[PDB]
Design a protein around this ligand. Structure first.
Ligand SMILES: [C][C][C][C][C][C][C][C][C][C][C][C][C][C][C]C(=O)O[C][C]([O])[C]OP([O])(=O)O[C][C]N([C])([C])[C]
Ligand SMILES: [C][C][C][C][C][C][C][C][C][C][C][C][C][C][C]C(=O)O[C][C]([O])[C]OP([O])(=O)O[C][C]N([C])([C])[C]
Ligand SMILES: [C][C][C][C][C][C][C][C][C][C][C][C][C][C][C]C(=O)O[C][C]([O])[C]OP([O])(=O)O[C][C]N([C])([C])[C]
Ligand SMILES: [Cl-]
Ligand code: NA
Ligand code: NA
Ligand SMILES: [Zn+2]
Lengths: 76, 83, 75, 79
């Protein structure tokens, strides 16, 4: 419950990759044909359909999903 | 086949995991034994990160670690003592 | 420009979300493996009446954020 | 009998909206016109809240306000 320098740098590099990743940005923009609820429903299962897990997939799903919430909210 | 988007996102995640292996490994090194210790430590890293400036990706990464902390407590929570 | 008023407002909203026994009971009733399908259903069923406010949003944020935790507890 | 939990969750949300009406109004009073204006103020409110201690609910409310700022930018100011 104290040392944070190294973790903070780690989160900056991961976070900056997600924030500037053109492919991830392109995918978020490609599902602007409505129902962000159903796309999340699908991608969430399909991305772990091979039985693998790592926290790169988690944060990728967090980022993609957090943008679908924005779009979902933009309908009211 | 079905689920092309999910697979593409899974591939991108694997690449992020690969390129930033050390960064994710560092996340597994600050695990906390209780919710209170996790809330304390989560607050310290969040405060440091916001002082360095933030973007959407940085907030997402912060919450990623947060769920790593929460998952550890939620499955393997302790009960104080070490202080 | 100023945050203390907003800060206390966020404390009060958040503490209700954190201590609401009904909300916690619902989150605990959606164990049994499948958080993905439960969120899919609740997200749409919550707005089936055509109404919207940010009380529903934060309630859904809280409920969904806890389902993510449970989902992670399997993998 | 189809959509009970969702409607049950909607009821809780409506009650929260009513009881903490003034609190949600305070969120609308601090909306920002641009993305970086939203990131700055989001930073100040987050750090202020974190200084008072946080629990799961307090983080969700912060991210709720964060999406309130985000939605306003992702629709208006800063087009
Ligand atoms: C987008 C929208 C939505 C949003 C979402 C996000 C939020 C944040 C999160 C992270 C946070 C992190 C920190 C904490 C950790 C811990 O610990 O954790 C555990 C559990 O388990 C919790 O704990 P507690 O709180 O202590 O508990 C509760 C109650 N019971 C029942 C569980 C006991
Ligand atoms: C992995 C991680 C990830 C996961 C987590 C996330 C969570 C999120 C949640 C939130 C979500 C929210 C949004 C929705 C909104 C609505 O409503 O939508 C429908 C419409 O459409 C509605 O419509 P109506 O109702 O019809 O109308 C409207 C009304 N007014 C009044 C507004 C106009
Ligand atoms: C659960 C986990 C999942 C993940 C997490 C979730 C949460 C998130 C955080 C909050 C967020 C913060 C608030 C503010 C921001 C803003 O503004 O917003 C708007 C626009 O819309 C946005 O901005 P930007 O993004 O930056 O811009 C756009 C992008 N580009 C591409 C253009 C750069
Ligand atoms: Cl929990
Ligand atoms: Na150090
Ligand atoms: Na070490
Ligand atoms: Zn653990």
């Amino acid at each position: 419950d104290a040392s944070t320098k190294k973790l903070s740098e780690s989160l900056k590099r991961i976070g900056d990759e997600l924030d500037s990743n053109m492919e991830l940005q392109r995918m978020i923009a490609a599902v602007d044909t409505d129902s962000p609820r159903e796309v999340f429903f699908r991608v969430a299962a399909d991305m772990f359909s091979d039985g693998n897990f790592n926290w790169g997939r988690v944060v990728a799903l967090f980022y993609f999903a957090s943008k679908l919430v924005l779009k979902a909210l933009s309908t009211k | 086949t079905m689920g092309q988007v999910g697979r593409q996102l899974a591939i991108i995640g694997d690449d992020i995991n690969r390129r930033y292996d050390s960064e994710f490994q560092t996340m597994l090194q600050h695990l906390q034994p209780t919710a209170e210790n996790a809330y304390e430590y989560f607050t310290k890293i969040a405060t440091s990160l916001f002082e360095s400036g933030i973007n959407w990706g940085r907030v997402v990464a912060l919450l990623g670690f947060g769920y790593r902390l929460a998952l550890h407590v939620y499955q393997h929570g302790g009960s104080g003592g070490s202080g």
